[PDB]
Symmetry: C2
Subunit: 154 residues, 2 copies
């Protein structure tokens, strides 16, 4: 019983998760924030100091942590998609947009983006096309989807 | 055991945030700081929330945070100064009470005589609650972080 936002950098996961957490009265968890608070260091500095393997392990620990808790609204990192069984974090909302759209709101990245699109679509409980929508439109659509979930029945 | 988390409890000034973060790094656990989590949710200092919503809403937010701690696992948790008043706080995990006397905490910082008696009274009362709920009681007075981490690590192992 978590709401879990997944998608690529630039998709607005942090902004949406926070607002929704406040509206639905849930615990707001931001993956990058939690990692940075633990290490007292920016995420990129963590990656550079400890190596990609350590960094990925931290991402996995965050994913496992998300799968353990309840009543949270979670913004996941750009690495979440690659962890083991990421759909177990809760009800997943994929914030979908094309590469050019995401790029403007922020190479190897394109490679990552191309190969990861299918994983997001598979893990999503709900796919939300975010292009050209303001925050209130997005929140409205998400709140409807959550109400539909909690209507069946519960 | 079946304790899911390490939970630091005690008054403000007892060093819960610093020790929980340090231990989280050393034992490779998730670091959760109650006040940080509340502030990132409302984008407001935890104090300003007391003023905008009811004191009852604030206690409700503190209770929801406690529920959350009781739900998760493999975290190292710095609880707030209100945590001791929540219900079923033992469900949060292995509780470590960071103990210090009033005089000491006053150093690690109520302009009126009356306000200080009130504060001391409050302190005295919560003292028995902390020592009640603690799985390990750690006096922090005049001890540096490496000494505190060493004592905690030993206790965890046992
Ligand atoms: Cl503190």
């Amino acid at each position: 019983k978590n709401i879990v936002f997944i998608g690529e950098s630039g998709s607005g996961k942090s902004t949406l998760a926070r607002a929704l957490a406040k509206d639905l009265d849930l615990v707001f968890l931001d993956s990058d924030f939690l990692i940075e608070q633990k290490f007292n260091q920016k995420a990129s500095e963590i990656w550079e100091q400890y190596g990609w393997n350590f960094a990925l392990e931290q991402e996995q620990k965050m994913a496992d942590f998300f799968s353990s808790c309840e009543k949270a609204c979670i913004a996941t990192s750009g690495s979440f998609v690659n962890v083991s069984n990421l759909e177990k974090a809760g009800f997943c909302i994929y914030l979908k947009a094309d590469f050019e759209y995401l790029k403007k709101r922020l190479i190897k990245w394109k490679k990552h983006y191309n190969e990861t699109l299918s994983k997001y679509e598979q893990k999503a409980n709900f796919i939300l096309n975010i292009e050209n929508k303001n925050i209130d439109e997005l929140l409205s659509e998400i709140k409807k989807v959550i109400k539909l979930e909690h209507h069946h029945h519960h």
